[PDB]
Amino acid sequence: DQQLVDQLSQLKLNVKMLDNRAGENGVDCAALGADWASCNRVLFTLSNDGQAIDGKDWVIYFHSPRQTLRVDNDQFKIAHLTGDLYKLEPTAKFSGFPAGKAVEIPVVAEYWQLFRNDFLPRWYATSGDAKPKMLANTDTENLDQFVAPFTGDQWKRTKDDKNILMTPASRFVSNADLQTLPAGALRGKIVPTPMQVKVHAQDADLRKGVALDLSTLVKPAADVVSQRFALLGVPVQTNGYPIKTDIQPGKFKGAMAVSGAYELKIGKKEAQVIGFDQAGVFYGLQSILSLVPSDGSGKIATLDASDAPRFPYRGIFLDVARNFHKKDAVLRLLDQMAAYKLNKFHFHLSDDEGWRIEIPGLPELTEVGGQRCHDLSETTCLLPQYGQGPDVYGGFFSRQDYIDIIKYAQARQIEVIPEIDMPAHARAAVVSMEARYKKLHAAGKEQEANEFRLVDQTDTSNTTSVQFFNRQSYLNPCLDSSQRFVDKVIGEIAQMHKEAGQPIKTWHFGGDDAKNIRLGAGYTDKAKPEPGKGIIDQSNEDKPWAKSQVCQTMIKEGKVADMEHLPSYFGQEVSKLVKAHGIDRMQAWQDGLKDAESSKAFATSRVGVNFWDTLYWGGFDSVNDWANKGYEVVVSNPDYVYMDFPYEVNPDERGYYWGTRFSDERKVFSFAPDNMPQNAETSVDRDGNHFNAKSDKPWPGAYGLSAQLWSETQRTDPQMEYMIFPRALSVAERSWHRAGWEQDYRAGREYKGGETHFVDTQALEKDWLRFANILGQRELAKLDKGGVAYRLPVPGARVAGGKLEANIALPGLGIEYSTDGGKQWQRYDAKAKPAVSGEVQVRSVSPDGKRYSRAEKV
């Protein structure tokens, strides 16, 4: 009853890692079904400072990105509902949570949990009809309230892991090749780096303001330029320093003859920007603005520059489905996209755990799919996921919100590409359409109920998704109604785009992970188990839709070859719907189209692919085929440009880490997207080891680059902003500019990590040093002004001769230190280092002085 739920809610949880390599130590992970026989032991402690809790009628729900495989306290048992949701219950031996006691519930989980962020907040209790309530100490974003600190080598994935744990002492080393450059060395350095520039000795003085000739721009775009001059402190006045603009495509030749190219002249008393188009004009103005200094001095260098994108497509992907992010945070994201010349906003509007766009005619998508709450019938919500609590969680963009966002992107030369992921990652839609079927069906409106249904009523398929949902994650690709559903959604979102003044140019089909993970190579069958693999029963495991009779007659009449091809078939069918709606480009996660013959198989004359294999796994050689078969390769490698991954190897950092252990500003910047093999000389793999890479195939070139912010653990908007900024500026640099150290692709060249020296690493490091200093001494101050909660790097620090030496990944940032356990903080000065003894803590501070990095002991 409620009293029992109230008691449970007052238990205090403690989660503590016990062994991240249990399989290296005596646990038979394989016998427990663990993938590749890897499992970890963790201790859940429930402390009860109240009277005894002896009732038995209860369930405690909790979330985890890892499956629980065993429970080592025979008073309790754990089972899975679906996705990340698990329930903890009392067994027949349960004898209560004793008054004033701590109950220990050790468990084994699949894989490893190397970051404290793996442990999700908001555990909650239930009991017969009572209302659910969270375990209070878990209702927080501060992991310290319920997750113990990692100790020793708990961060290691395996005994041979060569990653380097970042602490002030090792971080100091990681940062020691850097230094702070004098203002005099950072004159006339536009970001992103322009193709050709010549800086002269004088400076244009803007502090009295500028007279902007913006007749080349449509009003909304001009206002964006005017309002940015003001944000950076430069008045706009008719008697100010002249900045002229003109559009003359012909002035441009060859590779410069493309959207966004411009010529820019900065003189002593006037400015000139000649663009290839409005985008070029806008971008030229952005370059002038990138020069505006953070000191308010309003002085910029005179210079002569010529510039154009190395790629058409310079994108940022944002997941709002896993955890919603508000309109104001999308807008702050676009404002920064425009300032650094990104032009593509890939909007992941749906996935298993949420549907975020209102669709006229399909209200259930948002009424049910837009919120998650504790309802086991999933008639009014999706089941809770991601540690947001049992009560309603969600939101969605209304038609007007969405239209506003597109208008807002258009003003900033940013194209919005909507993604409605299918045929997997579609649980929100499938469950919403099931609620719709039922409602309509209950009124006897059987044709209306079936109109947009995404399930085949005979489908008993047993399939497990990558995030542990079941068949409800997969929209059936063989139903006419599924096609009716996709056609209606495309038609509705297409109209919103038209109303917003930016008709859709690319429809993103999604298409990732449409497979049963239990059929994977790291799992084996109970009957004849092979070694080192998770032992499961594969007798009743099936590919997706195997048991859909509709998908059977589909394959019989010969429309499709086999169950295996359903996903590409569906990608081709959607391309027809996309084309039927007047859109001539489709894009997808490359694995959904991997069974098509080539791009010739699609109805749109252009098919792009977000290439997301990792390099160390053959991605530097498998990407070639994608281009060679006619697809436009948007490079999206998870080992470099997945912004949901950690900035550094430290158990207190936020981020998933399946494709690599970290990707900081420097690593992103050092990625060479158009000569993938070369990354073997400039980066290490997921376990910190050197790797080799070589391809012998033709490589015509990439079409673009895209950095992704998946949102599983980015539960809030500030957390989203921390993960995107400031490493997105690196993305922007690399998406716009081809550096000199980025070598031409050479078939047959074999780059061997720690062995070959083909890459001009000296040039790479000098380039990075300058970029890092531009961020520290000028751009981060602009981020402060845009209000985005970017991550401030923790300082590196060492004590020599009894004096603090500190450094930072983005030279120019202020560094503070404390000699009192963080009670009083003081400004560290390089040329007058302080004397310390005992425990010293260090932290960095934003340029406007309001925010601090986390604090760490030296």
Ligand X SMILES: CC(=O)N[C@@H]1[C@@H](O)[C@H](O[C@@H]2O[C@H](CO)[C@@H](O)[C@H](O)[C@H]2NC(C)=O)[C@@H](CO)O[C@H]1O
Q: Which residues bind a copy of itself (CB under 8 A)?
A: 152-153, 164-165, 167, 169-170, 173, 179-180, 182, 185, 218, 248-250, 252, 255, 257-259, 277, 311-312, 498, 503, 579-580, 582, 584, 598-600, 602-603, 605-606, 627, 630, 632-633, 700-703, 754, 762, 766, 769, 798-803, 830-833, 835
**CB distance 782 to 232 below 8 Å:** yes
Partner interacting with residue 632 (select from a copy of itself, ligand X, none; CB below 5-8 Å by kind): a copy of itself
Look up residue 624 and give its DSSP letter: H
Shortest Å, Cβ 712 to ligand X: 6
Shortest Å, Cβ 524 to a copy of itself: 32
Partner interacting with residue 466 (select from a copy of itself, ligand X, none; CB below 5-8 Å by kind): ligand X
- Distance between CA atoms of residues 423 and 625, nearest Å: 23
By beta-carbon proximity to a copy of itself, the closer residue of 45 and 598 is: 598
The residue type of 481 is S
658 binds ligand X (CB under 6 A): yes
Shortest Å, Cβ 20 to ligand X: 14
**Tokens 């996705």 label which residue?**
83
**CB distance 8 to 135 below 8 Å:** yes
Residues 6+ apart with CB under 8 A from 457: none
642 binds ligand X (CB under 6 A): yes
Q: Which of 241, 469, 631, 710 binds ligand X (CB under 6 A)?
A: 710
664 binds ligand X (CB under 6 A): no
The greatest distance separating any two alpha carbons of the chain, rounded to the nearest whole angstrom, comes to 85
Q: How many residues does the chain have?
A: 858
Footprint of ligand X on residues 507-536 (CB under 6 A)? 512-513
The residue type of 826 is Q
By beta-carbon proximity to a copy of itself, the closer residue of 248 and 549 is: 248
Shortest Å, Cβ 658 to ligand X: 4
Shortest Å, Cβ 423 to ligand X: 14
Look up residue 838 and give its DSSP letter: S
SS3 string of 143-210?
A: HHHCECCCCCCCCCCCCCCCCCCCCHHHHHHHHCCCCCCCHHHCCCCCCCCCCEEEEEEEEEECCCCE
Partner interacting with residue 153 (select from a copy of itself, ligand X, none; CB below 5-8 Å by kind): a copy of itself
Footprint of ligand X on residues 54-113 (CB under 6 A)? 65
The residue type of 99 is A
Partner interacting with residue 644 (select from a copy of itself, ligand X, none; CB below 5-8 Å by kind): ligand X
Shortest Å, Cβ 65 to ligand X: 4
Is the link from the previous residue into 363 a cis peptide, with omega within 30 of 0?
no
Shortest Å, Cβ 495 to a copy of itself: 10
By beta-carbon proximity to ligand X, the closer residue of 282 and 589 is: 589
Shortest Å, Cβ 702 to a copy of itself: 6
- Distance between CA atoms of residues 46 and 748, nearest Å: 59
By beta-carbon proximity to ligand X, the closer residue of 157 and 547 is: 157
Q: Give the number of other Cβ atoms within 10 Å of residue 780's Cβ.
A: 24
Partner interacting with residue 249 (select from a copy of itself, ligand X, none; CB below 5-8 Å by kind): a copy of itself
By beta-carbon proximity to ligand X, the closer residue of 706 and 773 is: 706
By beta-carbon proximity to a copy of itself, the closer residue of 149 and 582 is: 582
541 binds ligand X (CB under 6 A): no
By beta-carbon proximity to ligand X, the closer residue of 512 and 733 is: 512
Shortest Å, Cβ 86 to ligand X: 14
Partner interacting with residue 700 (select from ligand X, a copy of itself, none; CB below 5-8 Å by kind): a copy of itself
Shortest Å, Cβ 338 to a copy of itself: 21
By beta-carbon proximity to ligand X, the closer residue of 658 and 825 is: 658
- Run of H or E residues at 237: none
161 binds ligand X (CB under 6 A): no
**CB distance 586 to 602 below 8 Å:** yes
Q: CA 311 → CA 159, 210, 259, 295, 704, distances in Å?
A: 42, 31, 10, 33, 5
**Residue 11: which region, alpha, beta or left (left: phi > 0; alpha: psi -120 to 50)?**
beta
The alpha-helical segments, DSSP class H, found in 213-357 are 219-231, 278-291, 327-339
Partner interacting with residue 658 (select from a copy of itself, ligand X, none; CB below 5-8 Å by kind): ligand X
Please classify residue 495 by burial: count the beta carbons closer than 10 Å to its beta carbon, then call 0-12 exposed, 13-18 middle and 19+ buried.
middle
By beta-carbon proximity to a copy of itself, the closer residue of 216 and 678 is: 216
Shortest Å, Cβ 577 to a copy of itself: 12
Look up residue 300 and give its DSSP letter: E
By beta-carbon proximity to ligand X, the closer residue of 284 and 651 is: 651
589 binds ligand X (CB under 6 A): yes
Partner interacting with residue 630 (select from a copy of itself, ligand X, none; CB below 5-8 Å by kind): a copy of itself
Shortest Å, Cβ 441 to ligand X: 32
466 binds ligand X (CB under 6 A): yes
Q: What is residue 460's three-state secondary structure?
A: coil
Residues 6+ apart with CB under 8 A from 16: 42, 43, 45, 147, 148
- Distance between CA atoms of residues 520 and 225, nearest Å: 52
Partner interacting with residue 22 (select from a copy of itself, ligand X, none; CB below 5-8 Å by kind): none
Look at the alpha carbons of 801, 806, 812, 817 in this order and tell me if their dihedral is positive or negative: negative
Is the link from the previous residue into 726 a cis peptide, with omega within 30 of 0?
yes
Partner interacting with residue 415 (select from ligand X, a copy of itself, none; CB below 5-8 Å by kind): none
419 binds ligand X (CB under 6 A): no
Partner interacting with residue 589 (select from a copy of itself, ligand X, none; CB below 5-8 Å by kind): ligand X
By beta-carbon proximity to a copy of itself, the closer residue of 265 and 833 is: 833
The residue type of 27 is V
**Tokens 């999700």 label which residue?**
120
By beta-carbon proximity to a copy of itself, the closer residue of 200 and 606 is: 606
**Tokens 């086999």 label which residue?**
562
- Distance between CA atoms of residues 840 and 837, nearest Å: 8
- Distance between CA atoms of residues 280 and 262, nearest Å: 5
Q: Which residues contribute to the site for ligand X (CB under 6 A)? A: 65, 466, 512-513, 589, 612, 642, 644, 656, 658, 710, 712
